[PDB]
């Protein structure tokens, strides 16, 4: 499972991740996230998306389905995701065909910064809610999820970060609708 | 997308192969999904993944047909569009074996001589713009039953009837 926690932030938590840890990428993500033709993802705790990932002149295009959090204290969910390789427009219109509707559209900036094995950190710029912090790590079983969210809070927590979030952004843009 | 479906058999398969010329050889297996609310029996849709062996490889194609057709090609993780599916609600109704033999008639008309489990032989044929023509075209093939009914439909249909 991919672990994987956020928090709130601002200039002095980004300026401070920059000054700490290894710079690899900055990416530009345009998410449609969409509703299910008969049940209600908000209800069961289910998402799925089309990522659009923009960096260094590539673009890379995901579909992700993502489960119900099973973590009370993390975001942690299972995961399945493939990556379009070519005819994007192609998945839309299955989607569409299907009944998934678009529910919003979700766009920011994410900067990754390396923080150690398999340890990542996302300075995100998210439009229309502000500046968040993100860290994710594997983990193989379930009752290992505990411990790494337990080691992934600490970082951020010696980072600035205060105020936590379990809700995806996707949520926090619905709740300003 | 003009086509149209034949009932065949070895002489009429025999037929095509002396006259047209050969394309391909393919097996196929499709994996034909019911969606997890709207009958795709009563709204005349479809949606399949189809895993085509021809030249040595394996090809993975996932189409959606409406009541007109959207296809994308599955050049990884297979698996996870099968757990997708799964997750989004969508179940497998039946799997369709059959071998496909193409053979080129004219520019842009296509046969394909179909061995299907648990069906038989068909002869399909089509072409994009024409039904006369290639009604014609099957029918002095030696065609003398035709079927709007897809694999998918006649091998459920001959499951009812059959319990």
């Given at each position: 499972?991919?672990?994987?926690?956020?928090?709130?932030a601002?200039?002095?938590?980004?300026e401070?991740?920059?000054?700490?840890?290894?710079?690899?990428?900055?990416?530009?993500?345009?998410?449609?996230?969409?509703?299910?033709?008969?049940?209600?993802?908000?209800?069961?705790d289910?998402?799925?998306?089309?990522?659009?990932?923009?960096?260094?002149?590539?673009?890379?295009?995901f579909?992700?389905?993502?489960?119900?959090?099973?973590?009370?204290?993390?975001?942690?969910?299972?995961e399945?995701?493939?990556?379009?390789?070519?005819?994007?427009?192609?998945?839309?219109?299955?989607?569409?065909?299907?009944?998934?509707?678009?529910?919003?559209?979700?766009?920011?900036?994410?900067?990754?910064y390396?923080?150690?094995?398999?340890?990542?950190?996302?300075?995100?710029?998210?439009?229309?809610?502000?500046?968040?912090?993100?860290?994710?790590?594997?983990?193989?079983?379930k009752?290992?999820?505990?411990?790494?969210?337990?080691?992934?809070?600490?970082?951020?927590r010696?980072?600035?970060v205060?105020?936590?979030?379990?809700?995806?952004?996707?949520?926090?843009?619905?709740?300003?609708?």
């Open positions: 499972y991919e672990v994987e926690l956020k928090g709130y601002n200039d002095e938590i980004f401070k991740v920059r000054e700490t840890f290894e710079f690899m990428r900055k990416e530009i993500h345009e998410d449609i996230y969409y509703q299910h033709p008969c049940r209600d993802f908000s209800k069961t289910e998402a799925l998306r089309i990522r659009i990932k923009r960096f260094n002149g590539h673009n890379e295009v579909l992700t389905y993502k489960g119900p959090k099973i973590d009370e204290k993390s975001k942690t969910r299972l399945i995701e493939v990556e379009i390789q070519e005819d994007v427009d192609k998945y839309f219109e299955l989607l569409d065909r299907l009944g998934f509707k678009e529910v919003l559209k979700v766009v920011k900036t994410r900067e990754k390396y923080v150690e094995k398999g340890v990542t950190i996302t300075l995100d710029e998210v439009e229309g809610l502000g500046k968040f912090i993100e860290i994710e790590t594997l983990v193989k079983e009752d290992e999820i505990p411990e790494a969210v337990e080691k992934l809070e600490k970082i951020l010696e980072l600035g205060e105020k936590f979030e379990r809700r995806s952004y996707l949520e926090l843009l619905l709740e300003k609708r």
